[PDB]
Ligand binder design. Structure first.
Ligand SMILES: *[C@@H]1O[C@H](CO)[C@@H](O[C@@H]2O[C@H](CO)[C@@H](O[C@@H]3O[C@H](CO)[C@@H](O)[C@H](O)[C@@H]3O)[C@H](O)[C@H]2NC(C)=O)[C@H](O)[C@H]1NC(C)=O
Ligand code: UDP
Ligand code: UDP
Ligand code: NAG
Ligand code: MN
Lengths: 571, 583
């Protein structure tokens, strides 16, 4: 039934909800090597399951990839004989050549009145948008020959079309374009490719061109696309009505160029308009798509199952960046979680957290000075000192804001970064015991500056890092301030989401090391803020620390900090 | 074969008309004899006020009827009768080759099907509540079901004024609507008392919907009616974390827009509903999509959602509301932009433009389909802002000393001098001689040292989206005259920076040239000023962030700002009191 979608023709009762948001697939025990290795890839995946009454999806062990020897009547009989068909409500089928010698229907010709289809050649009329998944057409050349991983750059050919047995109209148009421009467009004729007094090897000739042309000759989907992606040339699909594989999750606009078959003689002019930077980006995207989804049958099966699981469980679906980012840019990505550009008003203030240990004369001055500032919603005092007891309630300073003392089970320097449920604001000032040389207007202006930039640190102390060539390692520098890359957490405004990140989402054992060494907490906070937000800090006005910086850089694998030369002062 | 209900662009569309000229839409003239609803009038004014409007049918490759079509219910007060022969009488109908039809309601009481009434034929329908079983994947557009009180231009500026961690508030899942005793589409609401628990998940329904308030009431109306009180719906959407949006008479509802505005992550129950702008918007980032069949286990699924994902969903929901659903003009422009991007497959917005700030309505693929050419997606990629800028000088001597000082900058790739048609606002035109992304617009009367230029560029390096400039002016509201003011002396705060000594992006030049209507440009040219004001307005609107300051003519400014605010519908300008300086 082409008319129905997942909302009516799919049963979700079998897979209601699990703590591990993963779809459950079963393979019937009854084939080409392609289907055999596809089944093996399904078997050793996280989606495999037993106990048929507990599974949701069913994958039959039937050769349906190739329709040349399909025996449609036999396939229909097998689907009826599956013994768990149930109108084929939750059965997934894999196919890559859904075409017939009399006519290319661009879809599987089996009844499949309610089955789920994963085809290679899909037209806009034969594809269910919310139900089916378009999968790549496999070519053994991807695994048979291992082409070198040539980086993006200039190539001798600008356009290339290497296909055999094309329709005469497309060949004539390609020849017309070649004679119109010349020396950049190279059309090839009949594993071996032949030109006029020239012979080229098919797998390696594609590496010499930046744009490869894919034409609709039969089945609406050609295996040449996988080779095009492997070789790094940007595919140029000229099929009028054809949905590219995995177009639901992948962004083909950044990897392929679609030109309608009507403007086949205008392809070169269209391709000329694309700048070199976008050409390199599309080459990288094509290489990543091949190595992640087109290289192996296991990749196809995993991607299809992931798409289906995302459809079944939208709330646990993986991100667009996870789907279609190469690992290099994924390492280089930022993905700031506080990406919403809102300016909080002055109705809510900030909760001042004071960290004190074996000092009480400085505590009282700190509280008295902080109490002078407006917009002080709350003031919290953290008592890390376990042996010493807090002063009596009467002796506490007289303030008009709610003051409370936090009881600490242990004595760890990271107690200032714990997200307390008693805090009712998003801004959290962290002023320590010795910070007493600050005026009320300075703190008020710091909070004013923080309101414009709620997703980054706003602190008064200014420090920076540097790279030493003598030791080939990062150093620390504080005497001279020409640029600022770090801000000490003492008297530093930041979002309490940063406290949550520091406490819970910290790479490896960074916090367990700051506590052990009882130092380098501001360094860790600066590194975490730089790594998560991807933005610099705002400043408002030794060997151990260098080892801290080096260890933090080694844990991240890079330097998340950014160097800036700007500070905020009142107008 | 393919020209019937299964219409696509490759069959039921004429690309030849759109290839000849730019993407233009034509509005049929009003007959001055038939009633027109307020919502349809707002849609028509948005179309006419847009840059795609033209009066010549031959030039345009898209048509929209002026006859009311939003209300297609036979019992609705806004229904237009005898439309079957009325639409056919048009000379330019041409069986709806390139006709776009806006719609909000369809069907009658017995069954709310796709009862459009008149035979659309090959025309594309922008109906609001479209089921996925009758939605053309690349022909139709799904729009939100707005009400008659939706603002024409501007917006409510959202509700989320504080981003508090944890995002959880004193509620988990709320609902206060009206159940239906008989009909189609009340099954999801009649079983909400199973899910209801009271402490955190509170679902309220009422069965008083007309004559059946006491006639056909079941043995549960009284319990529901008594508990349907002491809990304001508006006063509930503000303390709620997840808003339930089920299916009623029609798949769509006003509750979706209210949930988007109230920052509560919607949990849709309308099975098989094509979400608004689903072909370009990823709703898994701003909403939680659920199935009404698994209604019982919904609260467990909602609780299973992680805290950071809840924060991301709320922020993306607020962004979507502020970008695509704030006003009917935004909805119309979104539909028009989707249709326009549907034409050229090599010039189109990718899936990242729509779902990321600022959005597709401010990012034009005609400038470039490469994300690196825009200042918005540097962090999403592994790219860094360009290290060179092209200075622009508009001259109508200090300029001789100025050019030497600007040329000494290490990051200054080239200098372009403009000499004057004496159009003083033409300096924002995109020039092919500009290669680098960053552009410094400089006035011949401005004195600026090379070190200051280097500092401005290195500050802009950290903020490629905003404008960094030395001159700053702010805006104030005048209560006596009820109009916005303009001050330029000893202002404590600021919200605008003059383009004469400011650094910004060349895409801002392109957006100013190809986005703002001709009327504002004509007003600017006739008044011979107020171009930097409009540039700052556009940048504040696109970025939702204030600019950054670094270290008779006056009376025309008030009129300029009033006209700009009237066109925009609100005040994009945001006050700032910080001033970035070198350390
Ligand atoms: C923010 O911190 C994360 C770490 O949690 C950074 O991701 C890490 O990035 C480095 C390189 O930048 C990756 O190292 C690479 O490892 C691969 C092997 O997997 C190796 O072949 C490469 O040559 C390179 O050494 C590291 O794997 C990666 N960590 C994870 C968990 O993926 C991220 O780059 C930081 N972001 C910023 C902006 O600093
Ligand atoms: O066991 C400890 C050790 C130190 N600190 C805190 O660490 C900081 C150390 O003070 P200071 O910044 O003056 O040290 P410095 O780096 O200047 O030597 C103070 O806030 C102390 O309260 C703490 O809370 N517990
Ligand atoms: O206490 C309430 C209940 C409903 N509504 C409004 O009613 C609509 C959704 O509820 P309703 O049951 O009327 O939707 P229906 O199911 O009738 O389509 C929206 O416009 C809500 O703003 C409201 O304002 N307050
Ligand atoms: C919901 O939030 C509003 C703030 O807009 C507050 O006034 C109201 O009291 C809250 N509701 C409850 C039940 O506390
Ligand atoms: Mn100290």
């Amino acid at each position: 039934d082409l008319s129905c979608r997942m909302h009516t023709c799919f049963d979700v009762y079998r897979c209601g909800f699990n703590p591990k948001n993963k779809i459950k697939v079963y393979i019937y025990a009854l084939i080409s090597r392609e289907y055999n290795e596809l089944l093996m890839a399904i078997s050793d995946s996280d989606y495999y399951t037993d106990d048929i009454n507990r599974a949701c999806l069913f994958v039959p062990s039937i050769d349906v990839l190739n329709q040349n020897t399909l025996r449609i009547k036999e396939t229909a009989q097998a689907m009826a004989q599956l013994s768990r068909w149930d109108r084929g409500t939750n059965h997934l089928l894999f196919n890559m050549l859904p075409g017939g010698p009399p006519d290319y229907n661009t879809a599987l010709d089996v009844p499949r009145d309610r089955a789920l289809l994963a085809g290679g050649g899909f037209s806009t009329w034969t594809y269910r948008q919310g139900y089916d998944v378009s999968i790549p057409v496999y070519s053994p050349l991807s695994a048979e020959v291992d082409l070198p991983e040539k980086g993006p750059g200039p190539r001798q050919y600008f356009l290339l079309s290497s296909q055999v047995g094309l329709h005469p109209e497309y060949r004539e148009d390609l020849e017309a374009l070649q004679v119109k421009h010349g020396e950049s467009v190279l059309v090839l004729d009949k594993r071996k490719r032949c030109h006029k007094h020239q012979v080229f090897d098919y797998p390696q000739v594609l590496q010499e061109a930046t744009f490869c042309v894919v034409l609709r000759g039969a089945r609406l989907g050609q295996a040449v696309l996988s080779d095009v992606l492997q070789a790094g040339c940007v595919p140029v699909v000229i099929a009028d009505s054809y949905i590219l594989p995995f177009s639901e999750v992948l962004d083909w606009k950044r990897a392929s160029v679609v030109v309608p078959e009507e403007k086949m003689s205008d392809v070169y002019s269209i391709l000329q308009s694309i700048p070199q930077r976008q050409i390199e980006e599309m080459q990288r995207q094509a290489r990543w798509f091949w190595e992640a989804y087109f290289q192996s049958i296991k990749a196809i099966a995993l991607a299809t199952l992931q798409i289906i699981n995302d459809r079944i469980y939208p709330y646990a679906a993986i991100s667009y960046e996870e789907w279609n980012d190469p690992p290099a840019v994924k390492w280089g990505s930022v993905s700031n979680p506080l990406f919403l550009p809102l300016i909080p008003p002055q109705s809510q203030g900030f909760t001042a957290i004071v960290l004190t240990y074996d000092r009480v004369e400085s505590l009282f001055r700190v509280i008295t000075e902080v109490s002078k500032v407006p917009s002080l919603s709350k003031l919290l005092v953290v008592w890390n000192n376990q042996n010493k007891n807090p002063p009596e309630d009467s002796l506490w300073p007289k303030i008009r804001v709610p003051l409370k003392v936090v009881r600490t089970a242990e004595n760890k320097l990271s107690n200032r970064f714990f997200p307390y449920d008693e805090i009712e604001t998003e801004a959290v000032l962290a002023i320590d015991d010795d910070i007493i040389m600050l005026t009320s207007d300075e703190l008020q202006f710091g909070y004013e500056v923080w309101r414009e930039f709620p997703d980054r640190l706003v602190g008064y102390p200014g420090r920076l890092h540097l790279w030493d060539h003598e030791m080939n390692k990062w150093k620390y520098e504080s005497e001279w301030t020409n640029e600022v890359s770090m801000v000490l957490t003492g008297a530093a405004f930041y979002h309490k989401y940063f406290n949550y990140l520091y406490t819970y989402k910290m790479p490896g054992d960074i916090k367990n090391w700051v506590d052990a060494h009882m130092n380098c907490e501001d360094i860790a906070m600066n590194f975490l803020v730089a790594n998560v937000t991807g933005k610099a800090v705002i400043k408002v006005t030794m060997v151990e620390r260098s080892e801290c910086i080096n260890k933090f850089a080694s844990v991240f694998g890079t330097m998340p900090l950014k160097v800036v030369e700007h500070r905020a002062d009142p107008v | 074969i393919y020209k019937g209900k299964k219409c696509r662009m490759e069959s039921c569309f004429d690309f030849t008309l759109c290839k000849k000229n730019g993407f233009k839409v034509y509005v049929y003239p009003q007959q001055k004899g038939e009633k027109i609803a307020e919502s349809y009038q707002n849609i028509l004014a948005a179309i006419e006020g847009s840059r795609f409007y033209t009066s010549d049918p031959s030039q345009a490759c898209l048509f929209v009827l002026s006859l009311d079509t939003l209300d297609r219910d036979q019992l609705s007060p806004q229904y237009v009768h005898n439309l079957r022969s009325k639409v056919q009488s048009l000379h330019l109908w041409n069986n709806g080759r390139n006709h776009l039809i806006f719609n909000l309601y369809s069907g009658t009481w017995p069954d709310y099907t796709e009862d459009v009434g008149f035979d659309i034929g090959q025309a594309m329908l922008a109906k609001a509540s479209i089921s996925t079983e009758n939605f053309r994947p690349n022909f139709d557009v799904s729009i939100p079901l707005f009400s008659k009180d939706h603002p024409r231009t501007g917006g409510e500026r959202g509700f989320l004024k504080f981003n508090t961690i944890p995002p959880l508030r004193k509620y988990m899942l709320v609902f206060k609507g009206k159940r239906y005793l008989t009909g189609i589409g009340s099954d999801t609401r009649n079983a909400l008392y199973h899910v209801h628990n009271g402490e955190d998940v509170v679902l309220l329904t009422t069965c008083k919907h007309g004559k059946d308030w006491q006639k056909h009431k079941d043995s549960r109306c009284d319990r529901d009616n008594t508990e349907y009180e002491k809990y304001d719906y508006r006063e509930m959407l503000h303390n709620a974390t997840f808003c339930l949006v089920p299916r009623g008479r029609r798949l769509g509802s006003f509750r979706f827009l209210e949930a988007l505005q109230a920052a509560c992550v919607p949990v849709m129950l309308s099975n098989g509903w094509e979400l608004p702008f689903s072909e370009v918007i990823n709703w898994n980032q701003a909403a939680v999509i659920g199935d009404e069949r698994l209604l019982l286990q919904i609260p467990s699924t909602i609780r299973s959602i992680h805290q950071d994902k809840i924060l991301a969903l709320r922020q993306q929901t607020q962004f979507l509301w502020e970008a695509y659903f704030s006003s009917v003009e935004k909805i119309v422009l979104t539909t028009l932009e989707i249709i326009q991007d549907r034409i050229f497959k090599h010039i189109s917005r990718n899936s990242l433009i729509w779902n990321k700030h600022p959005g597709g309505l401010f990012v034009l693929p005609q400038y470039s389909s490469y994300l690196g050419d825009f200042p918005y997606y540097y962090a999403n990629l592994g790219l860094k802002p360009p290290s060179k800028f092209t200075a622009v000088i508009h001259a109508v001597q200090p300029v001789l000393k100025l050019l030497v000082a600007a040329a000494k900058s290490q990051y200054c790739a080239q200098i372009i001098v403009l000499w004057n048609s004496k159009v003083m606002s033409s300096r924002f035109l995109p020039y092919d001689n500009i290669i680098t992304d960053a552009v410094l617009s400089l006035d011949e009367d401005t004195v600026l040292s090379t070190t200051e230029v280097d500092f401005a560029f290195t500050v802009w390096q950290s903020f490629p989206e905003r404008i960094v400039g030395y001159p700053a002016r702010s805006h104030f509201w005048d209560n006596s005259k009820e109009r916005w003011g303009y001050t330029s002396k000893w202002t404590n705060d600021y919200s605008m920076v003059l383009t004469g000594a400011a650094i910004y992006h060349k895409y801002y030049h392109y957006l100013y040239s190809h986005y703002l209507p001709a009327s504002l440009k004509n007003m600017v040219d006739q008044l011979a000023n107020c171009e930097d004001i409009l540039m700052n307005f556009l940048v504040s609107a696109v970025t939702k962030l204030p600019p950054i300051k670094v270290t008779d003519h006056f009376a025309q400014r008030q009129s300029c700002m009033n006209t700009f605010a009237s066109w925009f519908g609100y005040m994009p300008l945001i006050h700032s009191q910080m001033r970035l300086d070198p350390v």
